[PDB]
Design a protein around this ligand. Structure first.
Ligand SMILES: NC(=O)c1ccc[n+]([C@@H]2O[C@H](COP(=O)([O-])OP(=O)(O)OC[C@H]3O[C@@H](n4cnc5c(N)ncnc54)[C@H](OP(=O)(O)O)[C@@H]3O)[C@@H](O)[C@H]2O)c1
Length: 338
């Protein structure tokens, strides 16, 4: 295995990071991953099991420190920059979310350039960097990769989680400029809300949100309603499709630039009705007192046509397929009581 191609994944305890590591190993890569405390078995108890699937090395790094990633990405052919600050409700988002995001990403791409061996960097951003579009009124809109969240609007109005949206715009733009300056291929993936089982033992993130209609977690339900209100739809993708898309964009020489990753555009009401029918053993609310905001169908959709025309195909295309295994994960995590 000395001549295996080697992938770096930052944040191996994270939801997406853990799933990506598993896929990379299953597909025959050697992997190096960073976590902030490899001795923390509450967060990292899954890494020993993943080491049974293929060659996996675990390194200690905090991406906020310059040069922290140097050792882990040395010798790697691909770098998957998944880890990032995810402080949605920071009291001081400029200093606690936006600047750490930009600085953490430039730190990481700098390490990738320094390694000299990295053929491509795959940056995981978010749809939150795409869909804040207050200029679009009425329905019938489709967003593509040239849609950028309106940073001036976000900073002027500071709606909840605005700092997260802004951080994605700024880190993406900085990463792109830096990578062009240094002649390193960087492809950015902007996934929508991601659903499904992963190896990580202690995650919340989109599992809390995508299960909130079954759990009754009002914070998660507010995240779903917020996505719909601010973006014009409730968009979903299965973790397996996201991970396949990341490997595809790493491997496909002709791929370049930014890619939305999104399987389905739905709504709060459609999702609740679907879950109430599929999982009636949970108490799912489906009768909504208007809440005006609640759409009857998407007013703005996220288009994944760029990725699909590159040659990629989603495998989880219906709500049943997108929710094929997340409930068992939620139970295993204790997000769901039974
Ligand atoms: N889940 C979704 O629906 C979704 C959708 C679109 C985009 N994303 C993005 O995908 C990325 C992964 O998020 P996730 O959903 O998998 O959430 P998560 O489970 O909360 O994972 C976040 C990861 O980032 C790490 N991290 C944060 N700050 C770090 C730092 N300074 N140094 C090193 N690691 C740091 C975390 O490590 P610690 O535990 O040590 O903090 C953890 O590994 C995020 O950038 C998110 O914006 C997620």
């Amino acid at each position: 295995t000395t001549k295996l191609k080697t992938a770096c994944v930052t944040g191996g305890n994270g939801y997406i990071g853990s799933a990506l590591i598993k896929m990379l190993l299953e597909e025959g890569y050697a992997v190096k991953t960073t976590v902030r405390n490899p001795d923390d078995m509450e967060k990292n108890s899954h890494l020993k099991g993943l080491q049974e699937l293929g060659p996996l090395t675990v390194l200690r790094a905090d991406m906020d420190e310059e040069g922290s990633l140097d050792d882990a990405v040395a010798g790697c052919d691909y770098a998957f920059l998944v880890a990032a600050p995810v402080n949605l409700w920071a009291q001081d988002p400029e200093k606690q979310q936006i600047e750490p995001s930009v600085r953490g990403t430039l730190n990481a791409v700098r390490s990738c350039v320094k390694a000299g061996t990295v053929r491509r960097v795959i940056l995981t951003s978010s749809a939150a960097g795409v869909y804040i579009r207050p200029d679009l009124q009425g329905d019938g809109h489709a967003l593509d990769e040239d849609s950028w969240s309106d940073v001036d609007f976000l900073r002027a109005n500071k709606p909840p989680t605005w700092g997260y949206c802004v951080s994605k715009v700024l880190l993406e733009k900085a990463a792109c400029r830096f990578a062009e300056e240094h002649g390193i291929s960087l492809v950015t993936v902007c996934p929508v809300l991601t659903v499904g089982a992963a190896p990580a033992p202690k995650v919340r993130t989109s599992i809390v949100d995508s299960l909130s209609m079954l759990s009754g977690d009002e914070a998660g339900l507010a995240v779903l309603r917020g996505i719909e209100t601010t973006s014009g739809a409730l968009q979903l993708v299965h973790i397996d499709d996201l991970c396949r898309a990341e490997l595809f964009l790493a491997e496909e020489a002709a791929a370049g630039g930014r890619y939305i990753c999104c399987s389905l555009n739905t709504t709060v009401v459609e999702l609740a009705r679907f879950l109430a029918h599929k999982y009636p053993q949970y108490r799912v609310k489906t009768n909504f007192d208007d809440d005006e905001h609640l759409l009857e169908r998407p007013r703005v959709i996220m288009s994944s046509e760029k990725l699909v025309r590159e040659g990629f195909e989603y495998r989880h295309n219906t709500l049943d397929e997108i929710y094929d295994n997340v409930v068992e994960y939620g139970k295993a995590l204790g997000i769901l009581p039974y």
